[PDB]
Amino acid sequence: EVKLVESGGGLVKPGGSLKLSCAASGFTFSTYALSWVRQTADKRLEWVASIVSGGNTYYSGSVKGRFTISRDIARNILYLQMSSLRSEDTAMYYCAREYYGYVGLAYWGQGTLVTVSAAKTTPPSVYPLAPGSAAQTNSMVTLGCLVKGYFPEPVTVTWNSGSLSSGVHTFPAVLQSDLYTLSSSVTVPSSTWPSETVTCNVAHPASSTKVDKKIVPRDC
Amino acid sequence: DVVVTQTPLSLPVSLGDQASISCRSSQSIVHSNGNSYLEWYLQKPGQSPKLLIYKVSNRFSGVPDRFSGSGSGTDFTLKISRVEAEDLGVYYCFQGSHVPPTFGGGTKLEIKRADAAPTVSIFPPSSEQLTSGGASVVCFLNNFYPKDINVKWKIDGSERQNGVLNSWTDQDSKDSTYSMSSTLTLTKDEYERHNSYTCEATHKTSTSPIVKSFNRNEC
């Protein structure tokens, strides 16, 4: 099974440098061509670099001179050195392996988010969102978690650590004054609450933050 | 140079029906010896792009027959027969035969389902937050269709326009619905000068707004 895993992502200052890693496994690392493709905010996709089996390296124009692709044959690692970073380089970077030759990007990693900004790393504050009343609730109740004032992206939300998978809406983060804010709602059977415990577990890798907030019914 | 145009940006389609994405290049993709390196990719919300078709009409392993590619020269076409809910996402075509390899702008496939009204819920500021001197009032408008929805905020009868931030999800492969959150943030101080907090959901599924609210009236 082919498998690619990026890393090295994170917050970088304008003019800075960063070197990403793509841990390959499941195939003969030097047989196929490898590539980096980034995705800006507007879902825009842009090829960034490629290293062919021969050792040749090709680059786009918006990048030539600042980015460098290379591979550690023995260790099975694909790297992308990025220099003279500009806010425009902010994106999700994926490494992918061609199917064969240069016919198509058949395998992609999960990607690693690179943010270019002068802004400072900031942990999110997690606040519970529980029904303040109960005027006419059905066999379903909606709870949630407000996650605000954090930077940079991404952030991860989950309920009861995976147990509560279905009936969950985690809304995309909105930026405001160099700070992201996001919410997540979870809807479960009204009978299993407060009966059962519902907790949202937020994580924000950039600040090594990991928090769990239990949802308690609001008293008067 | 090499430019790639994808039409249309968004494409509504019913389950069981067919859809067709168009991709136009800026020169004959007549390689140098045979095939054309035109490719089709799908990126489902929250996931990575994945290969659907390569070399104009070559189905990649694991890809259903429903998907088919074709075309030549400057016009290429991705066709999707008997569409399923899982097929929703953003479709991209890719040019790699020329330098530099490039991606079309993309196309979002939307799924036409039954008109569905939103389930609205409102939440006052937590106590934790109020201690920090802040007050956010959250309102969830979950599982509705079509996407177009409008939320208006009202404080003690009057409507509030500032301090409101909205956010919409992508279409859910699950039930083909969309969800949205509207957040009203105020300072603990100002927040405590009013009693009635209301969010109204205006959607095509009704002539009158779905209204939820709470009063800081004791409880």
Side-chain angles (χ1 to χ4, degrees):
Chain A
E1 176 193 303
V2 180
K3 189 180 181 183
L4 271 26
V5 195
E6 296 98 327
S7 60
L11 172 72
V12 197
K13 292 176 180 182
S17 289
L18 196 59
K19 188 169 178 172
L20 310 168
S21 301
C22 171
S25 73
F27 59 102
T28 303
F29 195 73
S30 44
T31 296
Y32 308 103
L34 297 162
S35 312
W36 285 95
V37 168
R38 60 175 175 187
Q39 183 170 54
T40 30
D42 56 310
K43 298 295 80 181
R44 209 81 189 176
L45 286 186
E46 167 187 30
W47 166 76
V48 164
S50 289
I51 174 74
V52 288
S53 176
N56 296 296
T57 65
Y58 308 84
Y59 296 101
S60 41
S62 58
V63 159
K64 172 191 179 178
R66 299 184 301 129
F67 293 16
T68 319
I69 182 169
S70 63
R71 43 156 159 52
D72 179 354
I73 299 177
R75 290 211 285 164
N76 295 297
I77 285 284
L78 180 64
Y79 297 117
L80 175 69
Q81 180 70 58
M82 306 171 70
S83 302
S84 312
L85 291 174
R86 323 158 187 166
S87 277
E88 305 71 69
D89 298 314
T90 298
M92 174 72 92
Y93 289 68
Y94 305 82
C95 52
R97 195 213 86 183
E98 294 290 314
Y99 182 22
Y100 67 78
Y102 204 71
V103 195
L105 300 172
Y107 310 87
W108 300 56
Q110 250 45 63
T112 181
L113 195 61
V114 174
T115 307
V116 197
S117 172
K120 276 55 176 67
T121 297
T122 313
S125 293
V126 186
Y127 303 119
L129 293 180
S133 302
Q136 184 179 298
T137 28
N138 45 295
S139 71
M140 292 296 261
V141 171
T142 302
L143 304 166
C145 268
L146 182 64
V147 181
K148 81 173 300 163
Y150 68 94
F151 191 84
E153 276 272 58
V155 128
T156 272
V157 173
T158 308
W159 299 84
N160 289 331
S161 307
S163 297
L164 261 50
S165 63
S166 213
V168 170
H169 297 312
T170 305
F171 302 89
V174 173
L175 188 70
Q176 183 194 180
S177 303
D178 279 325
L179 284 192
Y180 290 104
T181 299
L182 136 190
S183 301
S184 189
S185 69
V186 56
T187 297
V188 300
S190 183
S191 62
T192 66
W193 195 81
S195 165
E196 296 304 293
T197 288
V198 184
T199 292
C200 79
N201 8 75
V202 186
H204 175 232
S207 70
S208 297
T209 295
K210 212 139 165 53
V211 180
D212 308 299
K213 196 80 174 196
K214 201 184 173 195
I215 308 167
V216 171
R218 304 198 201 195
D219 247 311
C220 291
Chain B
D1 234 305
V2 203
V3 191
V4 187
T5 321
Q6 224 176 303
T7 295
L9 300 193
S10 192
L11 162 53
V13 67
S14 288
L15 294 193
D17 213 332
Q18 317 178 73
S20 286
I21 311 290
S22 290
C23 182
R24 175 187 176 194
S25 63
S26 64
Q27 192 177 304
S28 297
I29 312 308
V30 291
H31 216 57
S32 62
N33 40 60
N35 281 293
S36 309
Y37 289 3
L38 194 292
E39 293 156 55
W40 292 99
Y41 297 99
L42 167 57
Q43 180 185 52
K44 294 177 175 180
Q47 296 182 52
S48 313
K50 56 168 192 164
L51 184 64
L52 285 187
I53 288 153
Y54 62 98
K55 280 196 166 182
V56 182
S57 59
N58 295 278
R59 212 192 311 305
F60 184 62
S61 285
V63 177
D65 65 312
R66 304 199 296 289
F67 299 88
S68 279
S70 63
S72 64
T74 281
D75 297 53
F76 293 104
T77 298
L78 171 59
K79 188 174 175 174
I80 308 179
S81 319
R82 312 161 278 294
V83 175
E84 299 176 0
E86 309 153 285
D87 301 325
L88 70 79
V90 171
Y91 290 80
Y92 299 87
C93 56
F94 178 64
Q95 188 76 78
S97 305
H98 311 52
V99 173
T102 59
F103 290 88
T107 299
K108 183 148 59 183
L109 185 68
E110 183 183 325
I111 295 182
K112 292 150 73 176
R113 57 149 288 163
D115 283 25
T119 303
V120 196
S121 310
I122 182 165
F123 304 89
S126 67
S127 297
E128 287 82 339
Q129 184 179 46
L130 281 172
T131 297
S132 305
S136 293
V137 189
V138 180
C139 168
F140 290 135
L141 290 60
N142 292 359
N143 306 82
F144 60 82
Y145 190 79
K147 187 182 169 180
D148 313 83
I149 190 171
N150 297 159
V151 100
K152 189 201 291 178
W153 277 92
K154 280 179 184 174
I155 295 185
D156 281 320
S158 305
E159 92 157 300
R160 175 70 171 238
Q161 272 164 289
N162 271 284
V164 179
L165 284 181
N166 294 176
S167 191
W168 305 256
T169 52
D170 284 307
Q171 182 155 47
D172 186 357
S173 56
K174 171 87 175 189
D175 57 24
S176 297
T177 71
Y178 293 93
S179 285
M180 172 208 162
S181 65
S182 194
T183 309
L184 175 61
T185 303
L186 313 164
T187 47
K188 176 198 167 200
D189 196 290
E190 170 196 39
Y191 172 69
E192 289 169 351
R193 285 161 162 271
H194 301 296
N195 294 71
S196 166
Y197 285 95
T198 290
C199 67
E200 319 185 321
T202 287
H203 195 244
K204 162 194 180 185
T205 48
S206 75
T207 54
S208 280
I210 300 180
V211 169
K212 297 287 184 170
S213 62
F214 62 99
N215 201 291
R216 288 177 53 252
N217 196 51
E218 240 57 44
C219 280

